[PDB]
């Protein structure tokens, strides 16, 4: 596909909705605030509307390599904070996916580039999980450390002054920590779903002790 | 809809799949490196993927509030980078939509907290282009802002130092800048496509010419 | 001098103190707040407190190249939050220097690497002034973008929310824009003080005009 | 101190200079770039150029809460990046300060404000090295901290793309982690010192080993 399909697809396309699903706009026209905030990979394999069968216009979505959810990167910050306080949103989905490009460079650490320096807090996480990866087979490290990313996303989200200050004055908000395959398309929840301080704390040991099993 | 909906239709329509469109993931499951990367809002009113019918795995996304291209924003530059010299994409979009909660919420300047940082980056762009918005009808300069964003962040992508390298090295990425409505869905070209550093000083140039006469 | 010769000249100042100014800590050991939060250069052509004759502890300090504060740059901000916030300084310096490594390469654009992005907050002033700019000497321009530099982050800052909440309560805090040369070392009030959101706008206006008379 | 008495003996210190100390700025004047890169505490309780005797325009610095080289920082990175390749620094020197306000706030954890976000990354430090605090005197574990930190934040600078390819490409730069305390103003060298890929890695080991034994 080039550019020109694109635009002439397009262009079709909207035409086609007046007599397929005239009222396909109808939710949009209505100033409808999204429940869901969707922190995802720009590798976006499986879109989050196909995988969960939810409508335009329901969902804020933020998209970064690898999801990451950094101390200090304002740009994924801003849309949290915009998301919590002013669409006020009810939860957060934080979603990974094995085989992701992003957490496999992070372990092969090829010279990529400015991405290298991005792809070190994956790292970081390698080092902090070394003794609960090498407790488990070969094959399935991998896949493991996709899902111990996303969990620290979660417990990183949590603990931003955006999440302490939400839950503190009693706001409802929770944050899930979830990841899906290409071999299925299966959304599967890593269990540490948080919905105040005392939650993210326990269920984020939860999630690790569930491997520790696994 | 609640969270335990999104979890059981994703179970149903994984294998609803099966026996309706089994080979759906076989282009994903086939290491097929996107050809397009996409900039868009957190807003996402309008899926990227339905407006121009790409498929999953076609395109690499970053999205943000405004779908912004700050200078200095490693998260969104890290994703220019790596799609540019790792995935080596051919074309880059920035598409705005007009409506768009941030660019509005920067011209009223309310007081919505940590977002507003994020937000001046758009106020000066309102500063710079403000005596050709006095030049036309007040119920089209917000809408005509939305296109000016546009047009300045694939002017700021096209001087970030990973886009000046990959086009002196004689790589082939094109640029383009994008917008649509929710009363249509139709994307409309802002013609500030830009595939090497003359072009990309000549058509933004260009872009705002047509405005002055729009 | 080499990385021996600072170890060796620390070990030796920090005796002959002892019999020379004993209570040179004595300030240091008490607990004192800085009052003045100073954000410079990273050349540090003659530091701040031999300009000043401020002593060690009274003031806190943040350096970075070209003395910016970028919208968005959350090192800086940090500083700032924590300046106004925690340790309530009285008075924010922001103080730039002709001659500056960081302006003239924003001007004359050469092939540095990375840093070619950060310095395109410093180009965008550059534009942004450029009929100013024209309407004065040539030997005078870089000189003039060096001052024009420090009232535009002088701006930034005082657009920050962190600055904007802060005038809201109430609390008294000062903006000062400020500009040195290596020839006298003599400091240059470029005369932008802003001690709230009304002066912040008025001054600014203050200072450009001065200039389309210089 | 007030702003009027800053200026003032501004004006009074350059003229005084003129029969005292003429070439003061015969070195200043005369392009020489800096041979050594300081990244410090925006704190700075004794200056850098006091604690080491080093004269204005040696040192190219920087200057953020609590000394850190975040992977993903670009405000420090830029200062990094034109510091190596631009300047051609050899020694780079990040140094901590035991009693440091940030490395306290970390661990005690009050509720700051935004500053909190910059803290974390401290606190990731101080979950990483448990078990070897826990193993010393609980009197000293604050201290301790702050010099793991300067180690931390070494590892983290030898470990960006910035240094990786300077140290290919065979450039000469070394790498120390130092901290001094109010007390003596007495620099201590935590013996972390890198010149390259090999030697970070061993160091850093040997640091931490030093304080298995302390
Ligand atoms: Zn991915
Ligand atoms: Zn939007
Ligand atoms: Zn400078
Ligand atoms: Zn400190």
Known sequence: KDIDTLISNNALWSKMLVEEDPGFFEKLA???????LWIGCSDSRVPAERL?????????VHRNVANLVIHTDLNCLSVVQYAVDVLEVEHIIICGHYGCGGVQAAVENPELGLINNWLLHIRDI???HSSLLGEMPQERRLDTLCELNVM?????????TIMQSAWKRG????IHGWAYGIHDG?????DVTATNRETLEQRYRHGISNLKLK
Chains 1, 2, 3, 4 share one sequence.
């Open 30 to 36: 209505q100033a409808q605030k999204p429940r869901f």
């Open 52 to 60: 969960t069968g939810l409508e335009p216009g329901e969902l804020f």
């Open 126 to 128: 390698w080092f902090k």
């Open 152 to 160: 620290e996303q979660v417990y990183n989200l949590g603990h931003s």
């Open 171 to 174: 706001q409802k908000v929770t």
């Open 186 to 190: 299966l959304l599967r929840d890593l």
